Symmetry: C3
Subunit: 532 residues, 3 copies
């Protein structure tokens, strides 16, 4: 009856009860709980700070703003990924360090349900936590779902390569939220002792990162990466970054006399100004002309010396870290449609040839980082198969899909396994009915397609075949089960082999059954082609 | 001789000696002593901070600037209230956290005279400490007089209802000055152990507030409210204030995305800008058209959760607080001329009728907060008396005068009495010869009229009848005596009955004699009319 | 070889090895090591703060920017003083609190060589540490040479005469660097226990200042002032400075309502803006028209109450301070050419007369501070000698040279001697072959001429007569020796008498031999002429 009121370390929070069809216990929902101090003014480009405690009762009943980002791009992605029926239009602001909590527990008791913290993707450029509705998953598997937000673009990843602005602000925000959960989740019926992180795309990469970070140690107990890991090069800036810093500085109208000078000048700029700079830059939009190597696609994770002490590669080559059950998965066709369409890929011809391929792959250097001396050899192994110009276009996509997620994922999984830690893999092959109209019916297992099963899209949206509804129920169980025991298995669900020496993984889809050696041939191949 | 030099915790202060006619020991006067760090830049809308200590000798010989406020309004009020012969023109600035000290002690000794700290009024919108000259009172009753300043308008009362800008900056400034006095007054011959706060209008309201605030506890030992208390609704913002915040924000040219966003944006604005916004808001002028309820008159005290933990009403219903001798007084005709004239009241006809009255009272909602369903009944009890349209105009004034000060004051006094604490009341009925020309000779005991007797106007200005001179001498004695023993009585002065169960109070004026049950009929009445 | 990497309290520093002709052990050189946090934003006009520690290895391999200053003036002086063959063009920035280290030690050992910290001159208006190359001196006398930088002009000396902006930021920066050396120099083979400060012109004045400052106590163990001391009036602002503050404020487009208001407003201004203001002020160029007394030449050292508790004069009249070996020297013709040419002195006629002299001396009031009632008498003692209009021009120069450096220096030296501390004086008379072309061959011992011998110019530049090369070798020995034992003497070098009661000093030049009572006649004279 009376709105739910929970007590947190910083003050009381007022939520709202929401009931899902066919469920007695209604879910308590809190929207916009702050987990850090608004990173405004001098706090820009600095680690997130603890939030100021409030004097009375804070109403967590309005969706928090999304971090500053390209408004069009953001709203668009929010629509294509949202698991709720009506997409919620959001506001933009630097004041976005909020998290949304969804608890199916009976607050009037001492419940200690498992917690699943979701890290939205968006290439570390755009995205939001309000996009994902935890209602379904919260109710169906009886787990507390938390959707966190973190600084994006410049605001969360600007780096000068030195102590004046190390960088990785966004990841720090992520860590911060995790501590908030440790220190508060208990009041929402969650068990701080069983926290599970999971995300997709950049969000999945972030999970991979936190699993390597000394800082994260002890903030979670199970991890899941969906279509995205740390070895996913494009998102990790290796090498001297100072140049990009100076570039951003200039475009923003700042001098570059010294690092300190740049950061200071940027701290002066208004959000609006920095947003225009973010636009001027043309990022995700894949540049075709000019020099492919000079084309800088973004500014993500970096080896700051705090969150990460060294490249992911070097890091995983060691087993001197707290290892936890890690689930690493990918989708049948990562580069099926969503991604290419969003970057404005020239493949709007529905066909390609060996010559136009090498050219395209080369201009794709910022997304695949392949030397132009290997391109021919790589193009050969994938396209030299058939003569059907259409098959080549599809093979070309698989090419990129393997370099960006395919191989990285498996490599990560193997290392984790070898480090002596529970590892699990999967390949989601299914075409959700919620797919966009502009998406061809032949694209199955496209980027983010799993999102709908994981977040129970069939129980919030409309017209889900019984098949889809069942698929979703199955995935949530696996996920939730993992979050519970660090093992997806359970009664009623197909057997999911652990990723050990036999390299078994689960193929999720219409026919969900186990398999082995995922992308084994590919990994083996690319590894050599990269050894030059 | 040699200018007076006193040592304070933050450094040496140089003053000036001023002799009053017929007094051997000249008074040492220090003007512009800082008691907090200039609330500039990022310090705006934040609690006042300790002042930076100075290296040599600071000359306290120039009147400090008055906090930013409507310059016309301010200078005008300064003239109508000033107790000195020539009104001193002041400067405006955000740097106004200063206090003026007036000590009749012989600094070359260890004097420990009682202290009286004066809080000027001005509706929390305008005012200044330099307006009041302590010379007379200081010399005549041998007490150290201190005139403090505190942030006004937006600068001192802007609030978003949450931790991003709780509010009550002004009251915090007031508390701050009080601590300064505890930590330093000893060096000017004052006794930190016997500090008495007193003020009028908003300043009187502030005294009432500090008497309820946990923060004030132990900073004073006697209190006096002249024509103004905490129950004086107009000055206390109860309810969700967020709306006014957003309104101010907009007028100032700021977004309203979140609270944090508003405060930050306002911190950017220049003083000039915020002053224009203050003007645009048309703060004091009473709006007649539009919806009377929508008309927002100001932005004063709020229930921040720091200075005040709950509404004054709720607070005084409890006796779990440090109680001190409290003197609560009012004047015969609070709404006689001063106030109406300053708000531009439509009563420039010298007469009114039952119908035009209810209309006027309704538009006066922001100043009386009376439901339009009671207005008729209220108008009846006061105006239904005679038919003389002129008498009604005068009765209408008394109506407001009772709701704004009359009843509140008495109720406050009663609660204080019942809380088991020395309580004293008075009703000042006299027409000072210093009254403005535009003030009719039939208005006696108008708002602020007591100010002239209290600050010894007859000994600084010119042409005071012996009667006025004597009246003043009498009031100062009562006041000073209270400041000394928490009891006005003393030899040579009429007997002042304590406000106990018989409800005795003192009628000050040409014929000063005791009386009983002040505004008893009214209180009783209004209480019911308000119980709907 | 592997670049030199040293560990400091704030992190690892990477340098570069540089070998000098005919020296086995190459010198390790580190350029741009930060010793304080960039004084940007709110840190402007505030004491320097500790630097932020870095996570990996900081490459100290690029010349740090020079503090904001008149670019033309700066580059010009850098050329005329530089001891290296090719003048290094620098960048301007508020981020300039860096120091350059030059160590001839074998970092692979526990070396503890003496340290010599150089404070460049430039009237506290311009200058840089990168101008002086320590390579030679470092190698030749086996001492660790450090060249520090400190805030200049407005940025480092703006003062309001009160706690809102005491001033002497620049000197504080200097002190700060010295603490850095105490806390870190050990890692570069230096001995924190044997630090020697030395500078020229304003830099020399600064040395004189640190020797009187309580703050400096224990940061050095030997001091050297070249052509510049604390009594050098022009550089020390005595009296109420508030006026200059308000002037600067106005020119910068700020109000002057209060001190706090001025400082705040100035903190807002951009570097560019303040640089334009610095230019508008026409600071170093000597004004001829208008009132000579009103002409304000600069804004240097002030009696802040922190760095300096009272005027140098009063201070040295006391012997209650830590006294160390102090070397005070001057050059034959301080006002020979460099200075006059740089202020745009009207003496471009190559001759003058008794009448035009008094007029010039008077307009020179901001540089000599002589009353117009003494000018005639002063002009007489120096010019009344011969009739040769040319001799007068030369005598006129000596006149100023004695008031600005000559007498002050000796007076300082005497006091130091009398305070019971090792004192040494010298008079450098030589014309370096590196002199500018526009410098007449008859000018010997011009301002800054010693700089070339001290920094080993003959070993870095080209075409040095064997005579010059030997002179330089000799000076470096004396200097280094002093830095070692607080006594210049040693085998192979002429005997340098200590400045005791006989007042012996060393005449350095082609024929280096001792002498006595330097400028004795002059001091005696001027002292009386000044006693009015
Ligand atoms: C954020 C998404 C697209 C947003 C877009 O805005 N639509 C297009 C143009 S818009 O002007 O306004 O119309 C996604 C879609 C595909 C994603 C990219 C690819 O999938 C490649 C990945 C590889 C990852 O591991 C790292 C991120 C990344 C290098 C990507 C960055 C980012 O998350 C992208 C680009
Ligand atoms: C972005 C859209 C273009 C809208 C535009 O107006 N053009 C329409 C027709 S044409 O192009 O100009 O010929 C879509 C509409 C249909 C899409 C194409 C077809 O649906 C065929 C697919 C096959 C996919 O698996 C790969 C992309 C793709 C090879 C396409 C590239 C692209 O996303 C297109 C061209
Ligand atoms: C400061 C004075 C006037 C301010 C004014 O702006 N002048 C008028 C027009 S101006 O364009 O430029 O000329 C005083 C005079 C009468 C005062 C008001 C009334 O007396 C009513 C009181 C009731 C109090 O308890 C609280 C303050 C208050 C609600 C007032 C706020 C304030 O102190 C006022 C308005
Ligand atoms: C603000 C002033 C108006 C100046 C204006 O130019 N009008 C002048 C004459 S008229 O109005 O237009 O009829 C003053 C001057 C005289 C004042 C009036 C009279 O003095 C009568 C008083 C009686 C008071 O106790 C109440 C206000 C009041 C009923 C008045 C309202 C108001 O303050 C007036 C009208
Ligand atoms: C830095 C030099 C000149 C600066 C100058 O600005 N150049 C000139 C004109 S500009 O664009 O070409 O316009 C030197 C040359 C002579 C120096 C001055 C004189 O030698 C007098 C000395 C006395 C010292 O003990 C203190 C510094 C000082 C009071 C000087 C300050 C400064 O170092 C000066 C002025
Ligand atoms: C600043 C220079 C002027 C360049 C200008 O174009 N004038 C050239 C010839 S004239 O002036 O116009 O007569 C130099 C060039 C030669 C210099 C002059 C001569 O060399 C004579 C010297 C003697 C010095 O010891 C004192 C300065 C000085 C008495 C000079 C003042 C000044 O620095 C001058 C005049
Ligand atoms: C500021 C605003 O208008 N939005 C609502 C906020 C939001 O939670 C946060 O702004 C983002 O979620 O929550 C409140 O209840 C609160 O914090 O007291 C106030 C308001 O109702
Ligand atoms: C106008 C003004 O008030 N500022 C004055 C301040 C005051 O000390 C404080 O403001 C408090 O009076 O400092 C002076 O008096 C002073 O030390 O010479 C001069 C200055 O004009
Ligand atoms: C952009 C630039 O060239 N500056 C250099 C700075 C300097 O340390 C400071 O500017 C002081 O010289 O930082 C480095 O040296 C470093 O720490 O690795 C790299 C860089 O080359
Ligand atoms: C206070 O002392 C300062 C410092 O000299 C001086 O400027 C000021 O005029 C003095 N105050 C007055 C006005 O007497
Ligand atoms: C640091 O300096 C070394 C040697 O000059 C160089 O190899 C390296 O690239 C530099 N690193 C940085 C931070 O640029
Ligand atoms: C927040 O929303 C709740 C509804 O649950 C409401 O009662 C409350 O008043 C709101 N906050 C305020 C005080 O405005």
């Amino acid at each position: 009856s009376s709105p739910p009121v929970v007590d947190t370390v910083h003050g009381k929070v007022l939520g709202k009860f929401v009931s899902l069809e066919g469920f007695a216990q209604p879910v308590a929902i809190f929207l916009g709980i702050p987990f850090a101090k608004p990173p405004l003014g001098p706090l820009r480009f600095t680690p997130p700070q603890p939030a100021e405690p409030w004097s009375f009762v804070k109403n967590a009943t309005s969706y928090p703003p999304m971090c500053t980002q390209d408004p069009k791009a953001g709203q668009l992605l929010s629509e294509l990924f949202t698991n709720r029926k009506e997409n919620i239009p959001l506001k933009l602001s630097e004041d976005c360090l909020y998290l949304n909590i969804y608890t199916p527990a009976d607050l009037t008791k001492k419940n200690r349900l498992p917690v699943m913290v979701w890290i939205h993707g968006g290439g570390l450029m755009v995205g939001a936590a309000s996009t994902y509705d935890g209602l379904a998953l919260a109710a169906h598997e009886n787990v507390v779902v938390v959707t966190i937000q973190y600084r994006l673009g410049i605001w969360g990843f600007f780096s000068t390569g030195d102590e004046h602005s190390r960088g990785n602000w966004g990841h720090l925000d992520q860590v911060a939220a995790l501590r908030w959960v440790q220190d508060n989740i208990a009041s929402f019926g969650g068990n701080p002792g069983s926290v599970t992180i999971f995300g997709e795309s950049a969000g999945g990469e972030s999970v991979s990162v936190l699993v390597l970070s000394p800082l994260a140690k002890n903030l979670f107990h199970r991890a899941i990466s969906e279509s995205g890991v740390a070895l996913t090069s494009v998102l990790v800036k290796k090498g001297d970054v100072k140049p990009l810093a100076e570039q951003i500085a200039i475009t923003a109208g700042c001098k570059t006399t010294t690092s300190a000078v740049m950061v200071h000048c940027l701290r002066q700029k208004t959000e609006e100004e920095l947003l225009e700079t973010t636009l001027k830059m043309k990022f995700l939009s894949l540049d075709l002309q000019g020099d492919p190597r000079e084309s800088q696609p973004l500014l993500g994770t970096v080896i700051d010396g705090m969150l990460l002490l060294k490249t992911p590669e070097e890091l995983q080559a060691e087993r001197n870290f707290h290892t936890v059950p890690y689930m690493v998965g990918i989708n049948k066709q990562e580069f099926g449609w969503l991604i290419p369409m969003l970057m404005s890929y020239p493949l709007s011809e529905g066909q390609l040839d060996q010559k136009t391929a090498m050219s395209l792959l080369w201009k794709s250097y910022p997304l695949v980082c392949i030397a132009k001396e290997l391109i021919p050899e790589a193009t050969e192994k994938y396209l030299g198969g058939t003569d059907d110009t259409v098959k080549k276009k599809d093979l070309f996509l698989d090419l990129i899909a393997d370099v960006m997620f395919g191989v990285p994922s498996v490599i990560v999984a193997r290392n984790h396994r070898d480090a002596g830690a529970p590892t699990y893999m999967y390949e989601f092959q299914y075409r959700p009915s919620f797919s966009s109209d502009m998406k061809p019916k032949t694209v199955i297992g496209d980027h983010g397609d799993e999102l709908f099963s994981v977040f129970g899209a069939p129980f919030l949206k409309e017209g889900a075949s019984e098949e889809e509804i069942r698929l979703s129920k199955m995935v949530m169980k696996f996920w939730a089960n993992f979050a519970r025991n660090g093992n997806p298995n359970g009664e009623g669900l197909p057997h999911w082999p652990e990723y050990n020496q036999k390299e078994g993984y689960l193929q999720i889809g219409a026919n969900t059954q186990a398999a082995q050696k995922l992308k084994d041939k590919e990994v083996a191949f690319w590894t050599n082609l990269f050894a030059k």
